[PDB]
Structures are given as structure tokens and as C-alpha cells.
Amino acid sequence: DAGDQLVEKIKPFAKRTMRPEVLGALVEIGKKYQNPVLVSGTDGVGTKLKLAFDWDKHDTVGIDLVAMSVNDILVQGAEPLFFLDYFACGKLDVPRATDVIKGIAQGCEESGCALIGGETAEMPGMYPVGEYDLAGFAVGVVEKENVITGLSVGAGDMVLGLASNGAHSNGYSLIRKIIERDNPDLDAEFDNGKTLREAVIAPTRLYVKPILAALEKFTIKGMAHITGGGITENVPRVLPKNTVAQIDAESWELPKLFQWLQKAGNVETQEMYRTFNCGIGMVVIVAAEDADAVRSFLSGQGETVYRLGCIRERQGNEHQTQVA
Amino acid sequence: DAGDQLVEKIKPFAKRTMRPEVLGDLGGFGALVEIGKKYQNPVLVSGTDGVGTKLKLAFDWDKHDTVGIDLVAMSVNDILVQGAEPLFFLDYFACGKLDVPRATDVIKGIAQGCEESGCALIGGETAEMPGMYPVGEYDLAGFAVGVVEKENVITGLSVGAGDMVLGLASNGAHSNGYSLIRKIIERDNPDLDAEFDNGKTLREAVIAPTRLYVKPILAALEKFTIKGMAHITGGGITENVPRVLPKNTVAQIDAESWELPKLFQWLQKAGNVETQEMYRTFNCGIGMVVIVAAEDADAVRSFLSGQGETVYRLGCIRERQGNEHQTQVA
Ligand SMILES: Nc1ncnc2c1ncn2[C@@H]1O[C@H](COP(=O)(O)OP(=O)(O)NP(=O)(O)O)[C@@H](O)[C@H]1O
Numbered sequence A: 001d002a003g004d005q006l007v008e009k010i011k012p013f014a015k016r017t018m019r020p021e022v023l024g025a026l027v028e029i030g031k032k033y034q035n036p037v038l039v040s041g042t043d044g045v046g047t048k049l050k051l052a053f054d055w056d057k058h059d060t061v062g063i064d065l066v067a068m069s070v071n072d073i074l075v076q077g078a079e080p081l082f083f084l085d086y087f088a089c090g091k092l093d094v095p096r097a098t099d100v101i102k103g104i105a106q107g108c109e110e111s112g113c114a115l116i117g118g119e120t121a122e123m124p125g126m127y128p129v130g131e132y133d134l135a136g137f138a139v140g141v142v143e144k145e146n147v148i149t150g151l152s153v154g155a156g157d158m159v160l161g162l163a164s165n166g167a168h169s170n171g172y173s174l175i176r177k178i179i180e181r182d183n184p185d186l187d188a189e190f191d192n193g194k195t196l197r198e199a200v201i202a203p204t205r206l207y208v209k210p211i212l213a214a215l216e217k218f219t220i221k222g223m224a225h226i227t228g229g230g231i232t233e234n235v236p237r238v239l240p241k242n243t244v245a246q247i248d249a250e251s252w253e254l255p256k257l258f259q260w261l262q263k264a265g266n267v268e269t270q271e272m273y274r275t276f277n278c279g280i281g282m283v284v285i286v287a288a289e290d291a292d293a294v295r296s297f298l299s300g301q302g303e304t305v306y307r308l309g310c311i312r313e314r315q316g317n318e319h320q321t322q323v324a
Numbered sequence B: 001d002a003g004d005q006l007v008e009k010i011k012p013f014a015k016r017t018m019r020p021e022v023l024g025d026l027g028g029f030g031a032l033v034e035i036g037k038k039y040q041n042p043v044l045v046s047g048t049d050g051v052g053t054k055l056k057l058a059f060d061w062d063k064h065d066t067v068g069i070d071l072v073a074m075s076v077n078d079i080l081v082q083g084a085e086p087l088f089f090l091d092y093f094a095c096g097k098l099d100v101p102r103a104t105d106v107i108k109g110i111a112q113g114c115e116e117s118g119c120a121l122i123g124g125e126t127a128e129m130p131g132m133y134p135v136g137e138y139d140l141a142g143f144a145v146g147v148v149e150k151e152n153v154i155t156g157l158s159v160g161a162g163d164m165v166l167g168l169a170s171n172g173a174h175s176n177g178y179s180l181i182r183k184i185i186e187r188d189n190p191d192l193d194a195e196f197d198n199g200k201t202l203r204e205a206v207i208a209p210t211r212l213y214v215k216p217i218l219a220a221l222e223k224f225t226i227k228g229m230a231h232i233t234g235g236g237i238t239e240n241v242p243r244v245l246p247k248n249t250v251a252q253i254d255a256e257s258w259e260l261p262k263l264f265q266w267l268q269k270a271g272n273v274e275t276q277e278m279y280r281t282f283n284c285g286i287g288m289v290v291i292v293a294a295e296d297a298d299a300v301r302s303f304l305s306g307q308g309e310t311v312y313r314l315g316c317i318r319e320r321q322g323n324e325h326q327t328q329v330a
């Protein structure tokens, strides 16, 4: 069987993601946790899969898949533990599927979680030749007293920003409409020694290792993963009803990729802040007394940290995240 | 947004699946589940699956309120065989254009399958991919997580010659072999609305949702020790039962110990399928296989039957002879 051929080829990829907790697929919880709470989430890649088909580039969308879930569970303080993926298609292409799952496993390695199982469904006729669908599922563990809830966020807290690797996994319907409209030279140098194509399909950044190392030394009051809805619709999810996150627009330069998308797309700036991450992949809220020490740590871990702004008292039905 | 509309419509359905372990409700970056020292050495058991080609019939007949039960059973029944209590569930729903009434119907069945299994439906994802799916069509993926004490993990390693093999009856073909069911139906055009069996139309028999074995099996585990279990999915009876059998044992099934249900009788005739090929393709009326000690077989059969199940004494375990196949039906 094709799927049986695929199962053997991916055994090496998954074997490198294993953890001592991995014993259906059985996972033990480390005695590290006294009162363990499980944090889980599911997601797909979105319309970025369309560029992966069109460009025949399948070895990175698996990193996008994993990041979408492990980064989501990360905001509660959870350490990612294990991951499962579901892969659906019409007729199985073992070399191309192997590439897809190889990237998944690679993203699991970077997140410190084990890829312990999955499912490859062949539905002949439901998918066009060459196309497929991906779903991922992540589970992490956090101590009950260490759950990051955002309830202590109050006026005076400083808003930090972790830089993103590009558009990540959101806003690609617009990126695709633009590219089909301009037919731009996708293989020309675009930024930081990467071609425009390389910048567009760049895999989503994982924040797991530096954020977890940070939590060993500091208290993080809240976090927001910047995905669907951009900055302004995602940060208010951890903010108390009475607080506003005020973002100074000049605290970070808009990366070149988003500068191109707004120009070509002719998008009002406030629509950009609610559509693309605009270079901000993860928002970390901390106490002002900790803001400097955390920024140095996260920068020393390899991240690019900005001081986006601070938390203030809300005035009425005021929007809870304003960039200006 | 359509998806924001769908999340609101399904929140009541998920709220009826909740358990005390679930912290918070639908909506939020992550879904929180506490375990509690109710478990001393807790082990998580998880699985993922889709519905398979049965969705094609769900499209054709415009019956979407039960394939979500099929989705749940495919995963919760899998983790059940290791002795795990299903705890929580997440679903992924992909389509081209979101049809909120139909999506509401699909997820409503998911919640119903979760309610019947005792697991909470705590989260999910609705992806709109315009152009990847024809109008009206969608894809389902589910993820189930259960808990078991490390010492109670059921592995089948103590299965030995002399143990009795019980069989739990199925509701039909469940979630496997449906590409073939569709080829047959599209060729013969049989009256799908005629009475066929047990006062149900043939259509009702074909699209019947997969049976959930969670509540009776977990209740059984309180009173008895189960040596092994098999959920009968792809590969039928003969390819799934040997998964829990030690290298040196064989499960011999007397074919006359249960009647092939009418639905499979029609599929064999219309498909012109060798009988030993049916045992490797369809569940043939056996949804779950339970192996127990011979001294417990009488009480276990009685208990599971009193819980609402149809129990057969499929056969017994014997010593394997060479490269002998580990499950033979005769
Ligand atoms: N896309 C995938 N990604 C990661 N692991 C996979 C994937 N597909 C299969 N596996 C694993 O390889 C093995 C293949 O088993 P599989 O053929 O999928 O049957 P099953 O999962 O037991 N249930 P079923 O889908 O009903 O046949 C399983 O252990 C999987 O966990």
C-alpha cells in the first residue's frame, strides 16, 4: 500500500521528536508537574497551502501547521508535549507527502514536543490531483498555579513584541490575489538576501523554546499569538475588560514584505493592523518593573524584541488595542 | 464573519458535553483540562481520524447530523481499547464556502457523539478554503484524548490459550468500506427508502452512525479485567484483531456464532465478494472484540448485555503454529 510505504519513510522523522514521556499512542506526564493542567488546540495551514501547491514547495508547510497550535497553547504557559496530524488527499503521492510530514516532524523537534501519531486519509475524488488538506493537534502541560490568564494585566504594564518571520499563516488569500495581479519577479532579491518567493512562503516562527526559558526566570502576565485578525483583533483576548493596549506605531519598522503588500494591495493602514501580523508574531505583556530584564532575556535568546507600548485604563467602549 | 456565526450556534451543543475537569468554555487561545490526583500515574491516550468515504454519501443524501458521531467513534473507540477513559475532543472542519446550517448540523452530531462517550468537546477550527472543496462539501478530522493509570493500560500481553473472545455487535459498516458501498448503490439504484431490516429503510441502514462502546466497556472495567480489545475498522475482523494478540496465539472464530446482518448479506451478494475477503474488509456485524479469561466469560457476557449491548461468544484463543495467520474465521 502507498500509505504503508509512507509510514515507513516517516518513522525516522518522528523518532527524532521523541521525549522520555512517550511510552493508540501513550504519553506519560512528567513528575515535574504536581498539579498538571492540559492545554490543547487544533489548526490548519489556511490559504498558504495554495502557494505550496502552485510552487510545489511542501517541506515547510508542516512547520506552519505545528507553529499554529504550539504557539497558541504557549500563551497559557504550557510546555508542548505531543502533536498529532491528519493528512487528507485524493491519491497519495509518497515523495510529496513525506516532505509534508518531514516539515511537521521538524516543527515538533523545534517545539520540544513528540509527533506520536497521525492519520493519512485517501479520499479518491474529493481532492484535485496534487492538492491535500492538513490539520494539526497539539497538547501541552502547565501547573495549575502557573496558568497565564491575563487577569493581573493592569494599567502600567509594558507591552513587548516578538518579531515574526513574515506573514506566517494568515492573510495569504490577499498575498495570492496580489501576486496573480502583478505577476511580480518572484525570484529577484527582495530583502535580507531572500527572494520575494522565499520571503512569502517563509515558515511561521516558533516561540516555544525562548518563551519557556523566560518563564523559568520571570512572570509573564499575558500573551497573544498574532494570527487571524492581525495585531488589533488578537491582543485584546488576554486583556481585562477595563484595559487598553496602546501601541506606538513608530516602535518598530514595518518589514519590507508588508510594505510591499500594503502598496500593492492599497490597504488602509488600520486594515493592515487587523489583517497581517505586520512583523509582530507574539505579544508579551509583563510588569513594567520586569520589562527591561525580560526584553534583554528574549533578545539574548535570539528574538527581536520591541517595546510596543503599555496598558492603560479603558474609556468606555474604547477599542482594547489601538496602534498609533 | 460566517465562522464567528458558527461558533455561536454550536456553543450550546458543546456546553452540554462538559465535565468538571474542563476549565473555562469555548473561546480562548487554548482549551484547559485539569487531570487531578484522581489519577496516581496518569497516562494520556490520544488518536486522530477522519470519517472517510462515508462523507460522500453524507453529501449525496444531504444527511449530515450523524457523520459527526462517526467521527467521534473512530477516535474514542480507538483509545478505549487501551483502557483509556475518553476525556476531551477537538474537531477540524474544512470547506470552500461555509454553510452555517450544514456546519451546525455536522458539529451538532460531534457534540452528540462526545456526550455519549463522556468526553468534552472543548475546541476546534473552522477553515474556509474557497476553491479547495466543491460547494456543499467539507472535510472532518477529529482528535480524542483519554486517561488511564499506567498500571491499567490494556496491552493484551497476558492473552493466552483458553481465553474467550467476545464480540460486540455493530450498527452497520460504521466508517469503513464505503467506497464499495457507493459503487454498488450507484450501479444497482436500489430503493433506498424501502423497509430493509429491523423496521429501518435501506438508507437508514447504510448511513447508520458508528456505535460507541465507551460507556459499557468502561463500566465493565470497574467489575472485570479485560485482557485485550480490538476496534474493527480498516481491514475488517481478520486484520484488526491480531493487533492485541501475542506472537504465539491465534483467535479462532466459529462463523456460526453470529448471523451476518442483512446489510452485509446484500453487500456480499451485490459485490460478489469471497467470504474470507469480507472478513478482511467489512466489520460484518462485529464492532468491538473483547478478550477475557474463560472463568469470566459468562459474567462479562451477561454484564455487557445488561448494559445494552449485543454480545456474541465469537470463539477462543489458541496456540499459533508457525507463520499461521493470527485470526481465522471458520
Ligand atoms: N500523517 C501521519 N502523520 C503522522 N503519523 C501518521 C500519519 N499517518 C499514519 N501515521 C501513523 O502510522 C501508523 C499508520 O496506521 P493507520 O494506517 O493510519 O491506521 P490507524 O491509525 O490505526 N486507524 P485507521 O485510519 O482507521 O486505519 C499509525 O500509527 C499512525 O499514528
Ligand SMILES: Nc1ncnc2c1ncn2[C@@H]1O[C@H](COP(=O)(O)OP(=O)(O)NP(=O)(O)O)[C@@H](O)[C@H]1O
Pocket: A041, A043, A068, A072, A227, A228, B007, B026, B027, B028, B029, B091, B092, B093, B107, B122, B123, B124, B125, B126
Ligand atoms: N469546528 C469547531 N468546533 C469546536 N470549536 C470551534 C470550532 N471552530 C472554532 N471553535 C472554537 O471558537 C474559536 C474559533 O476561533 P479561532 O479563529 O479558530 O481561534 P485560534 O486558535 O486563534 N485559530 P486561528 O485564528 O485560525 O489561527 C476557538 O476558540 C475554538 O475553540
Ligand SMILES: [Mg+2]
Pocket: A043, A068, A069, A072, A227
Ligand atoms: Mg491559531
Ligand SMILES: [Mg+2]
Pocket: B003, B124, B125, B126, B127
Ligand atoms: Mg477558526
